[PDB]
Amino acid sequence: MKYLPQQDPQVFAAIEQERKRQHAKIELIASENFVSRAVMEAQGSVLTNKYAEGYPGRRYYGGCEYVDIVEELARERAKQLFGAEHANVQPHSGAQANMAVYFTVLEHGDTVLGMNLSHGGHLTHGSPVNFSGVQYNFVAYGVDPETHVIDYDDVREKARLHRPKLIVAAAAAYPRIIDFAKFREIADEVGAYLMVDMAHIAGLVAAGLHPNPVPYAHFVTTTTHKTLRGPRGGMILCQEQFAKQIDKAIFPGIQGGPLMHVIAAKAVAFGEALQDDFKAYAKRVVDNAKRLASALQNEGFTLVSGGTDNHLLLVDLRPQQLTGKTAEKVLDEVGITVNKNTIPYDPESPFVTSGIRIGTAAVTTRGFGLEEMDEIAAIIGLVLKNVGSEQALEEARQRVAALTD
């Protein structure tokens, strides 16, 4: 940076602390990643100066010729990446992408069926403190108590009983492949739309390492960040038949001016994802997750669903008589970043929990591989089996430092 250090020492000092923190810590929060310098440059551009309400070639303001090129690059690259008929790259966030889809097909108080929040569902899939749970009548399907895999007969029964207008598939904390064909079959049986919220797995979908929801879903929502490794923001994919309605839902429906600089950064990220090396990256993410899962089991940890098919895993800490909160806290002391997370049928509140969620997208971006997964698992074992030993925690701290340099 050149101008920020002189103009705002306080803000610069804090940013520099954060940059150094990002390097020093082992980031295992499953939603996190590190974007490229090109992506950052794009959103640090003069495009922040441009109002561009509307869509390419159909804007409310003049002078949009070049931001139109940028937005269409984003849309076309997204369509190639996911094989979708339409893309809307304007959502400010994953939350706003979902909000727009809900606004498109639902009336206030309509019934929606989503994944149980305590089993892996997202806040925006019907939390009573979120707009989704307040505005619409959410009901939940669950995972099997033993296998922790989505119970598709429960999805079907809930759908047939409650007759939802919309079914939501997709999760914030589900370690297995989701069967979108079955979701669509159930949706078809009850005459409901299917929305897939692929935020966590979008990068894996792009790389062909998770089944693509696009052919099965009426609407697909996603973050552009997370496994897709893009700038912070949202996106909606859908068939041509819903394009006009979806576009109107985003604007003038729920948003105002789009963030054109962030949209530029989205284009950059989609460009990166189209490359062969991104596919190699995404395979390492999945390989690393399997390896880490196996290595954690080797340490004696129990994993929700017995492993992982994707970038993320959930440790059930009950065998160690630990809460997620306790584990999260002690790992923070040694430089490993995780988050506490409810496990299916958790006896604890969502604020304490019996689990920690772990993902490999961030460490993989940093170039970590299988050997590093083994060591990460060994450090976690050392820490969680010795929570009262400062000597053990110091050893862990040093081993974490050795990994990050």
The one-character DSSP state at 232 is S
Residue of 222, 339, 354, 364 interacting with its own copies (CB under 8 A): 339
Residue of 81, 89, 99, 358 interacting with its own copies (CB under 8 A): 99
Nearer to its own copies, 351 or 394 (CB): 351
The residues annotated with a catalytic role in the active site are 51, 53, 197, 223, 226, 232
Asked if 337 and 25 touch (Cβ cutoff 8 Å), the reply is: yes
Residue of 42, 95, 186, 206 interacting with ligand PLP (CB under 6 A): 95
Residues in 245-264 at the binding interface with ligand PLP, rule: CB under 6 A:
256-257
Residues in 264-303 at the binding interface with its own copies, rule: CB under 8 A:
264, 267-268, 271-272
Q: How far is CA 245 from CA 39, 133, 184, 219, 373, in A?
A: 30, 23, 21, 11, 45
Nearer to ligand PLP, 255 or 326 (CB): 255
Is residue 122 a contact point for ligand PLP (CB under 6 A)?
yes
Count of residues that bind ligand PLP according to CB under 6 A = 16
Distance CA 95, CA 99 (A): 6
The CB-of-97 to ligand PLP minimum distance in angstroms stands at 7
Nearer to ligand PLP, 98 or 365 (CB): 98
Asked if 92 and 255 touch (Cβ cutoff 8 Å), the reply is: yes
- Helices and strands, counts by H and E, the chain: 16, 15
Is residue 342 a contact point for its own copies (CB under 8 A)?
no
Is residue 31 a contact point for ligand PLP (CB under 6 A)?
yes
CA atoms within 13 A on the CB side of 215: 8
Distance CA 283, CA 370 (A): 12
Is residue 349 a contact point for its own copies (CB under 8 A)?
no
Is residue 49 a contact point for ligand PLP (CB under 6 A)?
no
Is residue 172 a contact point for ligand PLP (CB under 6 A)?
yes
| Element (DSSP H or E) covering residue 55 | strand 54-55
Residue of 26, 155, 170, 187 interacting with ligand PLP (CB under 6 A): 170
Asked if 318 and 302 touch (Cβ cutoff 8 Å), the reply is: yes
Distance CA 295, CA 116 (A): 29
DSSP E strands, 186-257: 193-197, 219-223, 234-238
49 binds, among ligand PLP, its own copies, none (CB under 5 to 8 A by kind): its own copies
Residue span 227-266 as binding mask against its own copies, x where in contact by CB under 8 A, dash where not: ----xx---------------x---xxxxxx-x-x--x--
The CB-of-343 to ligand PLP minimum distance in angstroms stands at 17
Tokens of 271: 């460009």
Measured CA angle at 212 (ends 211, 216), to 5 deg: 110
Residues in 112-131 at the binding interface with its own copies, rule: CB under 8 A:
123-124, 127, 129-131
Show Cβ contacts of residue 383 under 8 Å, excluding neighbours closer than 6 positions. Answer: 330, 331, 334, 336, 392, 393, 396
Stretch near ligand PLP under the rule CB under 6 A, chosen from 195-203, 266-274, 302-310, 329-337: 195-203
Is residue 19 a contact point for its own copies (CB under 8 A)?
yes
Nearer to its own copies, 46 or 390 (CB): 46
Asked if 290 and 359 touch (Cβ cutoff 8 Å), the reply is: no
C-alpha distance across the termini of the chain, in Å: 24
Beta strand 86-88 with 234-238 is: antiparallel
DSSP 165-176: SEEEE--SS--S
Distance CA 296, CA 224 (A): 30
Residues in 201-240 at the binding interface with ligand PLP, rule: CB under 6 A:
223, 234
Is residue 197 a contact point for ligand PLP (CB under 6 A)?
yes
If phi > 0 it is left, if psi is from -120 to 50 it is alpha, else beta; for residue 197 that is beta
Residues in 283-312 at the binding interface with ligand PLP, rule: CB under 6 A:
none
Stretch near ligand PLP under the rule CB under 6 A, chosen from 54-62, 69-77, 88-96, 202-210: 88-96
Tokens of 9: 């020492």
The CB-of-219 to ligand PLP minimum distance in angstroms stands at 13
Nearer to ligand PLP, 282 or 330 (CB): 282
Enumerate binding residues for ligand PLP (CB under 6 A).
Answer: 31, 93-95, 98, 122, 124, 170, 172, 197, 199-200, 223, 234, 256-257
